[PDB]
RNA sequence: CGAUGUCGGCUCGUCGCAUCCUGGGGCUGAAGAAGGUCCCAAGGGUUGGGCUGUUCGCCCAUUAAAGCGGCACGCGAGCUGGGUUCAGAACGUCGUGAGACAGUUCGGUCUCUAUCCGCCACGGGCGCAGGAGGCUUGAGGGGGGCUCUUCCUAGUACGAGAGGACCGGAAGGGACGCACCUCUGGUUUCCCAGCUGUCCCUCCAGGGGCAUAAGCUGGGUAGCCAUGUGCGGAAGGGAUAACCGCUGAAAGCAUCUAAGCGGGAAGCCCGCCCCAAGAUGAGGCCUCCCACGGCAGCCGGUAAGGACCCGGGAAGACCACCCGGUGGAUGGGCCGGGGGUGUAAGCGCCGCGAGGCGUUGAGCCGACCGGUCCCAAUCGUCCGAGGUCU
RNA sequence: GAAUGCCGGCAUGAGUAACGAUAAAGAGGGUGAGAAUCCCUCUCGCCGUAAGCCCAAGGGUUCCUACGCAAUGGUCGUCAG
RNA sequence: CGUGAGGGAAAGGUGAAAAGAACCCCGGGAGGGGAGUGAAAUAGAGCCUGAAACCGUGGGCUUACAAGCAGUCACGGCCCC
């Protein structure tokens, strides 16, 4: 190869347009049915340790 | 292509991955429950389920087959005397995986618990 | 649906059950229907079964024989309608399923390697005593 | 599956012992020859005083192949060598004996004399 | 690295 | 111009006249007519076929109305056959007789991102004689300053397969109406379990 | 000349036509067959090798043919580096010499990261006056387009003989293309077995690690595959090219033309296969929702629906796509079948022993075809119309 | 306003290449505001004419212990030359 | 930096006076929010003034059928005085 190189400085407009896909999606949280704390669905509740109705974990 | 191919690789060569399953199997049967990453936990289910099932059969052949993977006669005794009778009338499904809410700080890894079933 | 059963159902019109059972290492004679010019005759092919690859109705088997100095291998569909009959000529005892290694053996090296399967030979003589 | 450079045994009494294919005489650019196909060949090894000698460029029809050939009845056949019989420009053998089995395919391809001279036809 | 020679 | 929706079951072979015949088995029927496309109403002529019955516990209200206007149980797939106007209200395998010729359309197997050698039968480079990291590379993709660009339609690496493919003029070997089965000589696009479409051939 | 890398080859094409072959023609010093010559024609095709760095060319064996040219002598941020083109060395030659030679000879560093245009693929956004879930039309593109042999007609027409047709029909090939895994043939990193050395468990027996990122060896399912299998080039309709006419003046005859009308190419248009309404010219049909509450707008709450999350998938880089989420067979287990390996361990018997035999086609057993709620897809959340104007 | 000018600052490339041998990791317990990365235990792997041990050069407190984690450590850090 | 001869930097400023921010609050700390000092604290020690490139938050106008050395001339729309 022969070491390709930027031909021009990218403009502020073009730099930021490339970043139009960079915003984070906020986390998906559901209320835990036992303690009502917000937590990711399909995970053992980190606040009360419940899942599928029963205690599973010590918090 | 991976069409209809079964079995994760877990970025380990063939003898590292095998030793990985054996050491997790030793750990889960020692403690009843462990935490790993989700993909490791999902693979451990079948590897352990087969060993528990052999202990359910309980003959000498089945004990020697299990000792290839588990190596520890004490642990195998525990599996045959204490663990296996728990599952005499349970047709498969000896292990369960539940996903944990919080990732590991140092690499963001999704974690999960694996445990023997009641 | 069950696709496997549908295929087995399609194949069931062509499955045979009249042929003898044999194993790699057995010596067999296949009476095979051949089209030669205008007529069709039954030409026998006798040799060692060196391979059986199984797949239900699609299982095939390979027979090796020496003929006027040249080794001949012949592959047969086990349920082909062109097979008249199969005659067990001899039971041999092999230790593996595929006998490719006998291509490189001398005739006496093969005889020393595939001695008569005296057990299955006695079971053959045990049957054929029907009444 | 014979191609240029392939050595072949000679299954006749013409004196040639080994021929090397230099052409597959099946169209403009056939890659391979099988039983029943004609090749052009150079005679690499011969016995003394025979009809054909080392260096002759001859024609030959292929009679046996180690690549198995398939048949409409679902069967296949396979020999331990690749063998040919030297012929003249009317497809007739230039010898008087054919040694070893030959493929039944030679019959429908027009090589009836070779088929009758053969000790077995498989 | 030997320079290219347009000679 | 007849057609029917089907499922690829799998390949096997059968013996017909001392000949081995490779076949692909297709479960085709039965296909309820769900809608008819008319020149008065739609601008052209075709039948909307249904295929495979579906759990109504999965059919939303816009679809339930559509099936209702035709008086049909809910089916999993709706596909049109163009210039087909069957007399009955249901299409079965019996519209094909052994010996007819059919075209079969399926979704080919997907190779994902495919290299130039697998996708386009390119030759690659040498594997020795100094070949430097180009063993599977396409080589040149153009000229120089004229035209100074690459042709549209240039064969390059990219996605390959999981595309619509029609294999044409296959022989119907057998029709097994009891089982809604179609035997077709040769090979048919796609995986076992994939949807296919079986039309009367356009070759003469 | 503050650098436009320079031969040949390889790869990948694409174009021109002064056409090498295949298709259509006129003339022939064209009997036939085969030629010669010119016209039309660029749709497709145009082989493998020996020699040389070679381009070219000669030769061998074939072929329907082995076309000639352009694209920076197309293509080194695509590869090569034989040649050419530094430094070493040598020969012939020239020079007193140092040195010199499109003269020869042997050797001699070819730079991981692509910003923009372009190209191949794939998403996100918004638009397409109400909003949705489906099914579609095809403007416009792209793909494809080759050809030979034998047989019948018929040993006929023609020809003294040798030889040998048109037209029409039939079968079988080569290469190429798409798809496929039933068969044939591969692979199959742990699916089974055998083997050595060593260390270990537990002494025997039985096992485990390591010898490669499989220690080695013999096999090998699904998948992915070609060497294997199916299918394609068309048919047909239309308009033409050269070319051949019908009728027919000007010009009492003649003239394919000036009015008019026929025939006529592998080429052109359509037909086949694929994409395709960002076709902003944003299309059509079927079905569903509906006029919610507050000062073409606004903001909230909903509708039909959609998304998120999760179980996954011959779908896949990611995303997308497709299936499923307890009203469930989606993955994992388990069970049955298939399939592979090829007769486990243990015990009994024979042998001093290595081993042998029986139990036994045994045991183990990925993915394939299925069954089964034993395990996990818990529980939920968030969006989402009220339809401008003549 | 230019001198491939000089000194300094700050951009672009870009959340890109890379994070330095493919000997390799897994779990449980503990500590701590915080742990894949520190400590302990079991399992696994690697070297073993070394990747073990002892001298000489050279280096010059890096040694041991307590307290620490801004920076140095290619990540992290409660650990550390 | 260099074996060495030798080469050879960068780096000034709170306030009139430390009165250099007790005490409380969040935080492991860093850092901040109050309180307090001061004529002044965007003089708070990373301290006079504090330009420019460069980065960011908020607001007005504008932009998803469109061809561009980016301006200029004209007209219209919207926002502001
Ligand atoms: Mg380069
Ligand atoms: Mg390179
Ligand atoms: Mg390189
Ligand atoms: Mg570079
Ligand atoms: Mg520039
Ligand atoms: Mg740039
Ligand atoms: Mg700039
Ligand atoms: Mg700007
Ligand atoms: Mg900005
Ligand atoms: Mg950009
Ligand atoms: Mg980006
Ligand atoms: Mg955001
Ligand atoms: Mg691939
Ligand atoms: Mg794929
Ligand atoms: Mg791969
Ligand atoms: Mg699967
Ligand atoms: Mg595995
Ligand atoms: Mg996988
Ligand atoms: Mg990796
Ligand atoms: Mg790795
Ligand atoms: Mg790793
Ligand atoms: Mg990685
Ligand atoms: Mg290993
Ligand atoms: Mg515990
Ligand atoms: Mg853990
Ligand atoms: Mg882990
Ligand atoms: Mg299993
Ligand atoms: Mg016991
Ligand atoms: Mg096992
Ligand atoms: Mg869970
Ligand atoms: Mg999560
Ligand atoms: Mg951490
Ligand atoms: Mg980290
Ligand atoms: Mg099947
Ligand atoms: Mg023999
Ligand atoms: Mg024998
Ligand atoms: Mg032996
Ligand atoms: Mg023996
Ligand atoms: Mg026996
Ligand atoms: Mg011979
Ligand atoms: Mg001979
Ligand atoms: Mg001679
Ligand atoms: Mg000689
Ligand atoms: Mg000689
Ligand atoms: Mg001869
Ligand atoms: Mg004979
Ligand atoms: Mg299959
Ligand atoms: Mg039939
Ligand atoms: Mg399909
Ligand atoms: Mg489809
Ligand atoms: Mg597909
Ligand atoms: Mg490639
Ligand atoms: Mg391809
Ligand atoms: Mg290929
Ligand atoms: Mg190649
Ligand atoms: Mg090549
Ligand atoms: Mg290659
Ligand atoms: Mg290579
Ligand atoms: Mg390279
Ligand atoms: Mg290489
Ligand atoms: Mg390339
Ligand atoms: Mg160039
Ligand atoms: Mg250039
Ligand atoms: Mg270039
Ligand atoms: Mg240009
Ligand atoms: Mg796709
Ligand atoms: Mg296709
Ligand atoms: Mg056909
Ligand atoms: Mg059925
Ligand atoms: Mg220059
Ligand atoms: Mg410059
Ligand atoms: Mg320049
Ligand atoms: Mg330059
Ligand atoms: Mg330059
Ligand atoms: Mg080459
Ligand atoms: Mg011309
Ligand atoms: Mg011509
Ligand atoms: Mg001509
Ligand atoms: Mg003529
Ligand atoms: Mg003549
Ligand atoms: Mg002519
Ligand atoms: Mg052309
Ligand atoms: Mg061309
Ligand atoms: Mg040579
Ligand atoms: Mg050469
Ligand atoms: Mg040459
Ligand atoms: Mg040249
Ligand atoms: Mg020359
Ligand atoms: Mg010719
Ligand atoms: Mg010629
Ligand atoms: Mg040539
Ligand atoms: Mg040229
Ligand atoms: Mg050219
Ligand atoms: Mg030019
Ligand atoms: Mg020139
Ligand atoms: Mg020149
Ligand atoms: Mg060039
Ligand atoms: Mg070039
Ligand atoms: Mg280069
Ligand atoms: Mg070059
Ligand atoms: Mg370049
Ligand atoms: Mg380039
Ligand atoms: Mg360039
Ligand atoms: Mg050189
Ligand atoms: Mg030279
Ligand atoms: Mg120089
Ligand atoms: Mg010399
Ligand atoms: Mg001299
Ligand atoms: Mg002089
Ligand atoms: Mg002189
Ligand atoms: Mg002299
Ligand atoms: Mg010289
Ligand atoms: Mg020169
Ligand atoms: Mg010179
Ligand atoms: Mg000279
Ligand atoms: Mg000269
Ligand atoms: Mg030279
Ligand atoms: Mg010389
Ligand atoms: Mg040289
Ligand atoms: Mg050398
Ligand atoms: Mg060189
Ligand atoms: Mg190189
Ligand atoms: Mg490099
Ligand atoms: Mg680029
Ligand atoms: Mg770019
Ligand atoms: Mg770009
Ligand atoms: Mg540009
Ligand atoms: Mg672009
Ligand atoms: Mg889009
Ligand atoms: Mg829709
Ligand atoms: Mg849909
Ligand atoms: Mg329309
Ligand atoms: Mg359409
Ligand atoms: Mg169109
Ligand atoms: Mg367009
Ligand atoms: Mg077209
Ligand atoms: Mg064509
Ligand atoms: Mg005749
Ligand atoms: Mg004659
Ligand atoms: Mg004809
Ligand atoms: Mg082509
Ligand atoms: Mg292809
Ligand atoms: Mg396939
Ligand atoms: Mg495929
Ligand atoms: Mg298969
Ligand atoms: Mg296969
Ligand atoms: Mg096979
Ligand atoms: Mg295993
Ligand atoms: Mg061992
Ligand atoms: Mg011990
Ligand atoms: Mg032992
Ligand atoms: Mg043993
Ligand atoms: Mg070890
Ligand atoms: Mg070791
Ligand atoms: Mg080795
Ligand atoms: Mg190793
Ligand atoms: Mg091993
Ligand atoms: Mg094999
Ligand atoms: Mg193997
Ligand atoms: Mg396989
Ligand atoms: Mg197989
Ligand atoms: Mg397979
Ligand atoms: Mg495949
Ligand atoms: Mg092939
Ligand atoms: Mg036509
Ligand atoms: Mg007239
Ligand atoms: Mg006239
Ligand atoms: Mg006219
Ligand atoms: Mg006309
Ligand atoms: Mg006419
Ligand atoms: Mg016409
Ligand atoms: Mg044609
Ligand atoms: Mg479409
Ligand atoms: Mg639209
Ligand atoms: Mg559409
Ligand atoms: Mg409009
Ligand atoms: Mg629309
Ligand atoms: Mg996936
Ligand atoms: Mg994914
Ligand atoms: Mg994705
Ligand atoms: Mg969708
Ligand atoms: Mg579908
Ligand atoms: Mg869904
Ligand atoms: Mg659902
Ligand atoms: Mg749900
Ligand atoms: Mg399931
Ligand atoms: Mg289902
Ligand atoms: Mg299941
Ligand atoms: Mg899975
Ligand atoms: Mg079985
Ligand atoms: Mg079996
Ligand atoms: Mg036994
Ligand atoms: Mg035993
Ligand atoms: Mg034993
Ligand atoms: Mg004894
Ligand atoms: Mg034995
Ligand atoms: Mg099992
Ligand atoms: Mg089984
Ligand atoms: Mg099973
Ligand atoms: Mg059920
Ligand atoms: Mg909830
Ligand atoms: Mg100036
Ligand atoms: Mg300046
Ligand atoms: Mg500069
Ligand atoms: Mg200067
Ligand atoms: Mg400067
Ligand atoms: Mg400064
Ligand atoms: Mg600076
Ligand atoms: Mg600077
Ligand atoms: Mg800076
Ligand atoms: Mg900037
Ligand atoms: Mg920067
Ligand atoms: Mg910078
Ligand atoms: Mg950046
Ligand atoms: Mg990124
Ligand atoms: Mg980049
Ligand atoms: Mg990258
Ligand atoms: Mg880098
Ligand atoms: Mg690096
Ligand atoms: Mg990276
Ligand atoms: Mg590393
Ligand atoms: Mg290394
Ligand atoms: Mg090593
Ligand atoms: Mg572990
Ligand atoms: Mg660990
Ligand atoms: Mg650990
Ligand atoms: Mg830990
Ligand atoms: Mg605990
Ligand atoms: Mg840590
Ligand atoms: Mg930490
Ligand atoms: Mg580590
Ligand atoms: Mg530690
Ligand atoms: Mg342990
Ligand atoms: Mg040692
Ligand atoms: Mg000292
Ligand atoms: Mg020091
Ligand atoms: Mg620190
Ligand atoms: Mg730190
Ligand atoms: Mg810190
Ligand atoms: Mg400190
Ligand atoms: Mg640091
Ligand atoms: Mg750090
Ligand atoms: Mg470092
Ligand atoms: Mg601490
Ligand atoms: Mg220390
Ligand atoms: Mg220094
Ligand atoms: Mg220096
Ligand atoms: Mg110093
Ligand atoms: Mg100096
Ligand atoms: Mg002061
Ligand atoms: Mg003052
Ligand atoms: Mg405080
Ligand atoms: Mg506090
Ligand atoms: Mg605190
Ligand atoms: Mg701390
Ligand atoms: Mg403070
Ligand atoms: Mg604060
Ligand atoms: Mg403060
Ligand atoms: Mg005050
Ligand atoms: Mg303040
Ligand atoms: Mg101020
Ligand atoms: Mg101030
Ligand atoms: Mg002052
Ligand atoms: Mg200052
Ligand atoms: Mg200041
Ligand atoms: Mg400041
Ligand atoms: Mg800011
Ligand atoms: Mg702003
Ligand atoms: Mg704003
Ligand atoms: Mg437009
Ligand atoms: Mg607009
Ligand atoms: Mg514009
Ligand atoms: Mg301007
Ligand atoms: Mg303007
Ligand atoms: Mg005006
Ligand atoms: Zn909770």
Q: Which ligand is nearest to the CA of B104?
A: 32
**Among chain F residues, CA nearest to C55:** F12
Query: CB within 5 A of ion ligand 14: which residues?
Result: B 1; F 110, 112
The contacts of residue C55 (CB under 8 Å, 6+ apart) are: none
* Cα F72 to Cα F76: distance, rounded to the nearest angstrom: 12
DSSP F39-101: TTTTSS-EEEEEEEE--GGG--HHHHHHHHHHT---EEEEEEEET---SSSEE-GGGS-TT-E
Using DSSP's 3-state secondary structure scheme, residue A52 falls into: coil
* Cα B52 to Cα C93: distance, rounded to the nearest angstrom: 38
Strand nucleotide closest to residue B10 (CA to C1'): H25
Whose tokens are 């480079």? That residue is F125
Method: X-ray
Task: Please report residues of F whose CB lies closer than 8 A to that of D74.
Answer: 13, 15, 19-20
Report whether F9 contacts F191 (CB < 8 A): no
In-domain check, residue B1: no
* Cα A22 to Cα A19: distance, rounded to the nearest angstrom: 5
Alpha-carbon dihedral sign for residues F108, F112, F117, F118: negative
Asked if C77 lies within 8 A of D100 by C-beta distance, the reply is no
Tokens of C15: 């499955």
In-domain check, residue B22: yes
In-domain check, residue B107: yes
Resolution number, Å = 2.5
Using DSSP's 3-state secondary structure scheme, residue D113 falls into: helix
Longest dimension (CA), chain B: 45
Is residue D17 reached through a cis peptide bond, with omega within 30 degrees of 0 on the bond before it?
no
**Protein residues with Cβ atoms closer than 7 angstroms to any atom of nucleic acid strand H:** A 6, 9-10, 14-15, 18-19, 22; B 12-13, 15-16, 19-20, 22-24, 26-27, 30-31, 33-37, 40, 71-72, 104-107
Query: Residue B93 sits in a domain of what CATH number?
Result: 3.90.1030.10
In-domain check, residue B46: yes
Asked if F18 lies within 8 A of D74 by C-beta distance, the reply is no
In the 8-state DSSP scheme, what is residue C6?
H
For B19, the domain range is: 14-118
What are the angstrom distances between the C-alpha of C81 and each of B84, F12, F16?
A: 53, 16, 9
Q: For chain B, what is the domain count? A: 1
CB atoms within 10 A of CB C86: 21
* Cα D70 to Cα D108: distance, rounded to the nearest angstrom: 15
Report whether F42 contacts F80 (CB < 8 A): no
* Cα F47 to Cα F3: distance, rounded to the nearest angstrom: 9
* A abuts E (3+ Cβ pairs < 8 Å): no
In-domain check, residue B8: no
Q: Give chain G positions with protein CB within 7 A.
A: 3, 5-6, 10-14, 46-49, 60-66, 71-72, 74-81, 85-86, 109-124, 132-138, 142-143, 148, 173-185, 189-190, 201-202, 206-211, 213-215, 218-225, 227-235, 272-275, 283-289, 304-306, 308-317, 324-325, 327-328, 332-335, 337-346, 357-359, 361, 363-372, 374-381
In-domain check, residue B5: no
In-domain check, residue B6: no
Burial of F78 (0-12, 13-18, 19+ CB in 10 A): middle
Q: How far is the CA of C9 from the C1' of H6 (A)?
A: 91
C-alpha dihedral, C80 to F177 to F192 to C81, nearest 10° = 0
In-domain check, residue B24: yes
Report whether D48 contacts D54 (CB < 8 A): no
In the 8-state DSSP scheme, what is residue D121?
B
């Amino acid at each position: 190869a022969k070491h390709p190189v930027p031909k021009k400085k990218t403009s502020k407009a073009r730099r930021d347009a490339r970043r139009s896909h960079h915003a984070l999606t906020p986390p998906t949280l559901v209320p835990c049915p036992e303690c009502k704390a917000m937590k990711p669905p399909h995970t053992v509740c980190p606040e009360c340790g419940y899942y599928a109705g029963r205690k599973v974990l010590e918090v | 292509m991976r069409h209809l191919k079964s079995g994760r690789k877990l970025n380990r060569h063939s003898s590292h991955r095998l030793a990985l399953y054996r050491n997790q199997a030793k750990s889960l049967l020692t403690h009843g429950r462990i935490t790993t990453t989700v993909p490791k936990a999902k693979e451990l289910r079948g590897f352990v389920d087969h060993l528990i099932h052999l202990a359910k059969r309980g003959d000498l052949h089945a004990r020697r087959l299990v000792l290839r993977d588990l190596q520890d006669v004490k642990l195998v005794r525990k599996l045959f005397d204490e663990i296996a009778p728990r599952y005499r009338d349970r047709q498969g499904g000896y292990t369960r995986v539940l996903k944990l809410a919080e990732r590991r700080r140092g690499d963001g890894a999704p974690l999960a618990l694996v445990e023997l079933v009641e | 649906m069950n696709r496997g059963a549908l295929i087995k159902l399609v194949e069931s019109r062509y499955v045979r059950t009249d042929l003898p059972e044999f194993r790699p290492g057995d010596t067999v004679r296949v009476s095979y229907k051949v089209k030669e010019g205008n007529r069709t005759r039954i030409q026998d092919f006798e040799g060692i079964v060196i391979r059986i690859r199984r797949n239900g109705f699609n299982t095939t088997f390979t027979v090796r024989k020496v003929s006027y100095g040249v080794g001949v291998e012949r592959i047969f569909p086990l349920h082909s309608p062109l097979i008249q009959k199969i005659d067990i000529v001899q039971r041999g005892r092999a230790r593996r399923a595929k006998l490719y290694f006998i291509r490189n053996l001398s005739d006496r090296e093969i005889r020393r390697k595939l001695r008569a399967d005296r057990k299955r030979i006695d079971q053959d003589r045990a049957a054929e005593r029907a009444a | 599956m014979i191609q240029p450079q392939t050595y072949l045994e000679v299954a006749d009494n013409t004196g040639a012992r080994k021929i090397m294919c230099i052409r597959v005489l099946k169209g403009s650019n056939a890659k391979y020859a099988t039983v029943g196909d004609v090749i052009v060949a150079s005679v690499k090894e011969a016995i003394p005083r025979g009809a054909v000698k080392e260096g002759d460029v001859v024609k030959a029809v292929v009679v046996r192949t180690k690549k198995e050939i398939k048949r409409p009845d679902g069967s296949a056949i396979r020999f331990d060598d690749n063998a040919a019989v030297i012929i003249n420009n009317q497809l007739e053998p230039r010898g008087t004996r054919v040694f070893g089995p030959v493929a039944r395919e030679l019959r429908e391809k027009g090589f009836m004399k070779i088929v009758s001279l053969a000790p077995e036809v498989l | 690295m030997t320079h290219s020679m347009r000679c | 111009m007849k057609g029917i929706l089907g499922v690829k079951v799998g390949m096997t072979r059968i013996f017909r006249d001392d000949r081995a015949v490779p076949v692909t088995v297709i479960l085709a029927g039965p296909c309820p007519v769900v809608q008819r496309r008319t020149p008065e109403k739609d601008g052209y002529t075709a039948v909307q076929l249904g295929f495979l019955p579906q759990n109504p516990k999965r059919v939303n209200r816009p679809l339930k109305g559509h099936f209702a206007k035709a008086g049909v149980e809910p089916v999993r797939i709706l596909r049109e056959i163009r210039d087909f106007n069957p007399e009955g209200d249901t299409v079965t395998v019996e519209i094909f007789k052994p010996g007819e010729r059919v075209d079969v359309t399926g979704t080919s197997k997907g190779r994902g991102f495919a290299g130039v050698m697998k996708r386009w039968n390119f030759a690659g480079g040498p594997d020795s004689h100094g070949a430097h990291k180009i063993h599977r590379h396409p080589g040149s993709i153009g000229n120089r300053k004229t035209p100074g660009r690459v042709y549209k339609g240039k064969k390059m690496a990219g996605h390959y397969g999981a595309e619509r493919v029609t294999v044409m003029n296959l022989e119907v070997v057998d029709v097994i109406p009891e089982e809604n089965l179609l035997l077709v000589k040769g090979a048919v696009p796609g995986p076992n379990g994939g949807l296919v479409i079986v039309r009367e051939t356009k070759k003469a």
